[PDB]
Amino acid sequence: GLLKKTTGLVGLAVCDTPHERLTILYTKTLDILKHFPKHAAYRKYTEQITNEKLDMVKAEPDVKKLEALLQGGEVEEVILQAEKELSLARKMLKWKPWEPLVEEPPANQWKWPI
Amino acid sequence: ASATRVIQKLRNWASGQDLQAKLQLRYQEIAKRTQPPPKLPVGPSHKLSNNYYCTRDGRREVVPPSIIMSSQKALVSEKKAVTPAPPMKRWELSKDQPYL
Amino acid sequence: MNLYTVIFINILLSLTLILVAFWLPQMNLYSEKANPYECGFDPTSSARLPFSMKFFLVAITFLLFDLEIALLLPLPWAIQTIKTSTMMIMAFILVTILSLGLAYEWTQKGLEWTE
Amino acid sequence: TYKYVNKKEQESEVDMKSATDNAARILMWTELIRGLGMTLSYLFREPATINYPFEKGPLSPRFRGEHALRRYPSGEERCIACKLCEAICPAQAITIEAEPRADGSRRTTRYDIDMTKCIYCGFCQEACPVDAIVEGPNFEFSTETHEELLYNKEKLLNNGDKWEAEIAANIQADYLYR
Amino acid sequence: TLDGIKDRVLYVLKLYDKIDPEKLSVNSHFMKDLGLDSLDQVEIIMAMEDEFGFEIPDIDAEKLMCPQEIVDYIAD
Amino acid sequence: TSVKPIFSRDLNEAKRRVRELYRAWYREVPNTVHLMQLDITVKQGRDKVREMFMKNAHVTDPRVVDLLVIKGKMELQETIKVWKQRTHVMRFFHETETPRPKDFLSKFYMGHDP
Amino acid sequence: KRPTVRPRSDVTHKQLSAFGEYVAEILPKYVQQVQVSCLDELEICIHPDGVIPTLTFLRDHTNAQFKSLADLTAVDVPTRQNRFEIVYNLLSLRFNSRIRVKTYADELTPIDSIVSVHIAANWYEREVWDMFGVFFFNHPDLRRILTDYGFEGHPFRKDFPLTGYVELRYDDEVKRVVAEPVELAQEFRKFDLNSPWEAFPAYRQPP
Ligand SMILES: CCCCCCCCCCCCCCCCCC(=O)OC[C@H](COP(=O)(O)OCCN)OC(=O)CCCCCCCCCCCCCCCCC
Ligand code: SF4
Ligand code: SF4
Numbered sequence: 090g091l092l093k094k095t096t097g098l099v100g101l102a103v104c105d106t107p108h109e110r111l112t113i114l115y116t117k118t119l120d121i122l123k124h125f126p127k128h129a130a131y132r133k134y135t136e137q138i139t140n141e142k143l144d145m146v147k148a149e150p151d152v153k154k155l156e157a158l159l160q161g162g163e164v165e166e167v168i169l170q171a172e173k174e175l176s177l178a179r180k181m182l183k184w185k186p187w188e189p190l191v192e193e194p195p196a197n198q199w200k201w202p203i
Numbered sequence: 204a205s206a207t208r209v210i211q212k213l214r215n216w217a218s219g220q221d222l223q224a225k226l227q228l229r230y231q232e233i234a235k236r237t238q239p240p241p242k243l244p245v246g247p248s249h250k251l252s253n254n255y256y257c258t259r260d261g262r263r264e265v266v267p268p269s270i271i272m273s274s275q276k277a278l279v280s281e282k283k284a285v286t287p288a289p290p291m292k293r294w295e296l297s298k299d300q301p302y303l
Numbered sequence: 304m305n306l307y308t309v310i311f312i313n314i315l316l317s318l319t320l321i322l323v324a325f326w327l328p329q330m331n332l333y334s335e336k337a338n339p340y341e342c343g344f345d346p347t348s349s350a351r352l353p354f355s356m357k358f359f360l361v362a363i364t365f366l367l368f369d370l371e372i373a374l375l376l377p378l379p380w381a382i383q384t385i386k387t388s389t390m391m392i393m394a395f396i397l398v399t400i401l402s403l404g405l406a407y408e409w410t411q412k413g414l415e416w417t418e
Numbered sequence: 419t420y421k422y423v424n425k426k427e428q429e430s431e432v433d434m435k436s437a438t439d440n441a442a443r444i445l446m447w448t449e450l451i452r453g454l455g456m457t458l459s460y461l462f463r464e465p466a467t468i469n470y471p472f473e474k475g476p477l478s479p480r481f482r483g484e485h486a487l488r489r490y491p492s493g494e495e496r497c498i499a500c501k502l503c504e505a506i507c508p509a510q511a512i513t514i515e516a517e518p519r520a521d522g523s524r525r526t527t528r529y530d531i532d533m534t535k536c537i538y539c540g541f542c543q544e545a546c547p548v549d550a551i552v553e554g555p556n557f558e559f560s561t562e563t564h565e566e567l568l569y570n571k572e573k574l575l576n577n578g579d580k581w582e583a584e585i586a587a588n589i590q591a592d593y594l595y596r
Numbered sequence: 597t598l599d600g601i602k603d604r605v606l607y608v609l610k611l612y613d614k615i616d617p618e619k620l621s622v623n624s625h626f627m628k629d630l631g632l633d634s635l636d637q638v639e640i641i642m643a644m645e646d647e648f649g650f651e652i653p654d655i656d657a658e659k660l661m662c663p664q665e666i667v668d669y670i671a672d
Numbered sequence: 673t674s675v676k677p678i679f680s681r682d683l684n685e686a687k688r689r690v691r692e693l694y695r696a697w698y699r700e701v702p703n704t705v706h707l708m709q710l711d712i713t714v715k716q717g718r719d720k721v722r723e724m725f726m727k728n729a730h731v732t733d734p735r736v737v738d739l740l741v742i743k744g745k746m747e748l749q750e751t752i753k754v755w756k757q758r759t760h761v762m763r764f765f766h767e768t769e770t771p772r773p774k775d776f777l778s779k780f781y782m783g784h785d786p
Numbered sequence: 787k788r789p790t791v792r793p794r795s796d797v798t799h800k801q802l803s804a805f806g807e808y809v810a811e812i813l814p815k816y817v818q819q820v821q822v823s824c825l826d827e828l829e830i831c832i833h834p835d836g837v838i839p840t841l842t843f844l845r846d847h848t849n850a851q852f853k854s855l856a857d858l859t860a861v862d863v864p865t866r867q868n869r870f871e872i873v874y875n876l877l878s879l880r881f882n883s884r885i886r887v888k889t890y891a892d893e894l895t896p897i898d899s900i901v902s903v904h905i906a907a908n909w910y911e912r913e914v915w916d917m918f919g920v921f922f923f924n925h926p927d928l929r930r931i932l933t934d935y936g937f938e939g940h941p942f943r944k945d946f947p948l949t950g951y952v953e954l955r956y957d958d959e960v961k962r963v964v965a966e967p968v969e970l971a972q973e974f975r976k977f978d979l980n981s982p983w984e985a986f987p988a989y990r991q992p993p
Contacts, residue, residue: 265986287881
């Protein structure tokens, strides 16, 4: 439609070309989650999410309808969240959160009242 | 209240708007200081019958918190993704004064 | 000598006043009241240290503009000359030159401060 | 619902008239003459101040100030040393030490209030079951000594015998609410 | 340069105010015969850094245990 | 036994940091008696440093030593800067507290305390 | 329907239990004891090694945008050997929800810091170190905030006296605000208020 000269949030630019940056970021997430093992849950859930949002992008070209379908505020907030999820995916690849529990606690640790 | 009708005019012009009606002080339009006695009302649970504290206790209807994935016990944590709640629906722009 | 007298009178007023201010009252001196303020706590260093000035270019051009004032100021006598065209052109040139210099400084961000 | 406070709807409509108006706002300080006129208007209003010692601020019966130990109309001392005014006092300002009076009566041998710990909260008078200690209207009991603001039974009873003519009325006015 | 360091260091020692130099020598250990714990040795090493004009770490300082080792250090 | 470290594999690697801290204090005292006009000599300031060090020489846990080093660095920061005033520094010396009698019979003459 | 008691819903409880299963099965290397209370406040409990990964997850994950730190507390319980229960209250602003991440510590078992995730945690970690004595790794400043500069002690520890061990007053002999030991003209009067009767059978501890 138009270029929405003012996104209401401060410090956030406008991204004259959306429907591309989101494809980039979601494809990158999908391509990095392949390195996760299958039994991991972050892989599955993030794949579900990114596939749904990628389908939303492929479907709707209008930025306003895309926002209202893609409940993340303005499209620039959604793009920021995609970048940040990508960063998280790398960090989780390094951390290996899916492993079993390390050093279960003493018994009287979360028991309350005491 | 006493402004001799020309100083009233001066202040209402320099200000920009009538202030003899909307004054900073209080003369006689205030609730006076000695009043009649009240009769304060009485809330429910004064029913005199069919009112037992075991039925309308709140402080006892609590429970210890429910538990998922306790390492102590043997609890176990296709499955669709989840949110802590549905997304907070966007706010609508005002109608009485949207652009101040 | 009238003017000298007026100024001496004002001088002696000020000095007599300071003499009164110092030798009339009472004194209770001690090191904890005679040390610099700095808002309840003590200073972390001396005040006789560099205070970076961030308008020094503005100061220097103020000096040059002061000289421009000194050059413009003879005009009330320059106007009672017979020519009244050479002085016009020359004052025009002086003021226009000063304005040109101001504009160059402005555009080159000399009137802005050194952040 | 929300609304913008400093967001222009849209720009880019200017003609020589609007330019003249803006250039006259500038170069005449027109939006500053309004401030001058406002302060001038305030010069010609009735000031809100009062000749304090001779005319004073309005208070209500609920106002809670200096303390007092009250009596019954018979003159009997009204406290009974039930010792919960100090249970609830969240500053630990009150002390009591109690004994039988040789008449065979629950009464105090001590009622102190460090009025430098009191926070003037009213909990003591809304906890007393007999309306014995109250928080009265006097707010003009400043002192030149810390030791004067540490009260005992006799000072509180002096306050009560002094301010009963006011406290009885304040209580009569405010009860049916408490 | 070498043998000036000897009496230089030894004068610093003499001024240290806690060693009583009647026992003192260049091969004199600090811990055993003089009974100076690590902090006194650290003070000594600072006195040497004050005599000269080069900083030095604590590992070298703890490798040092007598004035002769100090002298051997100032070369390198 | 079988516990985690903080900054120290062993006690010798903690004494290293201890000596670095003693060094910083020794080199700071002459500047603190000068900047804020203390009325002591540099000798007894450094003796106070060694006293407040030997107040904790019995310790052998590396973790406790590291935490004490941390708190010493905090106090050194506060003292290198003038965040703390002459009052706080001369607080160390106890220039008003009479000496606690370390003798039986004196304690018996004044007080029921041991 | 009863007026005096507080109303009750179930959809919030179910949502938060679902999200608790979510976190529990997505982050098993660290998570212990997810729980949801009568009042619906989700509360995840975490191994201290999992702090940065869990907080980064809840900040940056799409279905959990907990990108605002509200509080960062600590709670001293002298009974348990790992005394200090540390708490992280968060909110999302995308789902209009809160969550609570919890860890545990001790006097000599510190925790990684969170300025790499939430810059708001700087002064809170400083406060926690000052009040309870929990050191935080790779923190920029980590000095006191609230206590006086020359102050020994971690006051909000339960074993610390309310009145302290030092008291201040000015002295003419030295012209300073010296610190004398503590000597009060009126001892704090401890009151023994707890009743000897089980008020709430639901929390009854068996032997
Ligand atoms: C025949 C053809 C030739 C004719 C030639 C003549 C042409 C007309 C000349 C008109 C020029 C009038 C002089 C105007 C000078 C001020 C210039 C100006 O723009 O205002 C300066 C300043 C700027 O305000 P700002 O909104 O920030 O705009 C600047 C953006 N660059 O705004 C300010 O200065 C405000 C800050 C100062 C506030 C001080 C308080 C003022 C209170 C008002 C008191 C007025 C009383 C004056 C009485 C004087 C009596 C001696
Ligand atoms: S509550 Fe009232 S009656 Fe009881 S001790 Fe206090 S003043 Fe006396
Ligand atoms: S008013 Fe409050 S603080 Fe004051 S004495 Fe009564 S209970 Fe204590």
